[PDB]
Amino acid sequence: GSMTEETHPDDDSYIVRVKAVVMTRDDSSGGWFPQEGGGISRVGVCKVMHPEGNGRSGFLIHGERQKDKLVVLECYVRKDLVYTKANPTFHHWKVDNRKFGLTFQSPADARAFDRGVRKAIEDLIE
Numbered sequence: 270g271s272m273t274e275e276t277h278p279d280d281d282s283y284i285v286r287v288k289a290v291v292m293t294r295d296d297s298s299g300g301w302f303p304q305e306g307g308g309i310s311r312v313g314v315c316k317v318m319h320p321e322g323n324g325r326s327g328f329l330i331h332g333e334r335q336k337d338k339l340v341v342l343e344c345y346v347r348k349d350l351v352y353t354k355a356n357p358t359f360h361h362w363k364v365d366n367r368k369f370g371l372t373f374q375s376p377a378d379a380r381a382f383d384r385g386v387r388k389a390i391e392d393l394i395e
Contacts, residue, residue, distance in 0.1 A: 276315050277331060278338050285385040286313035287378040289371040291332055291342040292359070301359070301370060305341035306334030312342055312371060314385050319347075328389050330362070332371075344369060350393055352386050360386065 276282040291310040292301040312332030318325065328350065332342035344364055354360040360382060361370025373379035 270320055276317060276329070277340065280313070280315070282315040282317065283313045283331075284316050285381070286311070287382045287385070288312070288335070288375070289373050289378055289382070291334075292361070292370045292372055294361075294368050294370070296367065301361075301372075306336070306339075309335035309374065310341055310371070311335050314389060316389075317345070326392075328393060330369075342369070342371075346393075348393065350390060352390065354383065 289310060289312055291304060291306050291312060293304045294301050310332050311334065312330075315329050315331055317327045317329045319327065327345070327347045329346070330342065330344035331340065333339050334341045344362070346364070350362065352360060352362045355370075358373045358379065359370060360373070360379075361368055363369075371382075373382065
């Protein structure tokens with residue numbers, strides 16, 4: 270919780286796990302550059318919530334690199350998420366602070382991620 274932070278190293282609350290390369294566009298610095306990891310990233314989605322416990326839940330776009338627990342992607346959201354899939358093999362999102370994204374490595378993780386995103390936004394908004 271506030272003390273002892275799970276849902277990150279031990280994963281635990283990971284409802285979805287996909288595989289892709291964590292990309293990012295630092296404003297316009299070159300373009301979609303691999304922030305970290307590069308060689309595949311162990312990314313996923315965990316449905317978090319406020320410790321108050323009122324049913325209402327949030328979402329955390331969290332992802333380690335494909336090299337054990339090293340957080341290379343972290344995008345916590347409370348009630349706000351705007352995704353945009355630019356290409357069938359590249360889905361991205363803007364959190365005001367930069368515009369992050371990832372490059373799919375198979376139609377499996379592609380469709381799986383889009384599915385998770387769709388459901389996430391769905392329950393997040395209504």
